[PDB]
Fold actinomycin D.
Amino acid sequence: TXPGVTXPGV
Amino acid sequence: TXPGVTXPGV
DNA sequence: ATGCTGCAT
DNA sequence: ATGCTGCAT
């Protein structure tokens, strides 16, 4: 995710 | 992937 | 160290 | 049934 907690996605 | 064999990703 | 996701062939 | 992506905090 994010980053943090990529995207989603990428 | 693709689809097929989405993306990656999505 | 954590933390989601999407279908054509 | 079978493919895989990506970093700030």
Q: What stands out?
A: The interface with chain B takes residues 7-10 of chain A (CB under 8 Å). Residues 2-10 of chain A lie near DNA strand D (CB under 10 Å from a C1').
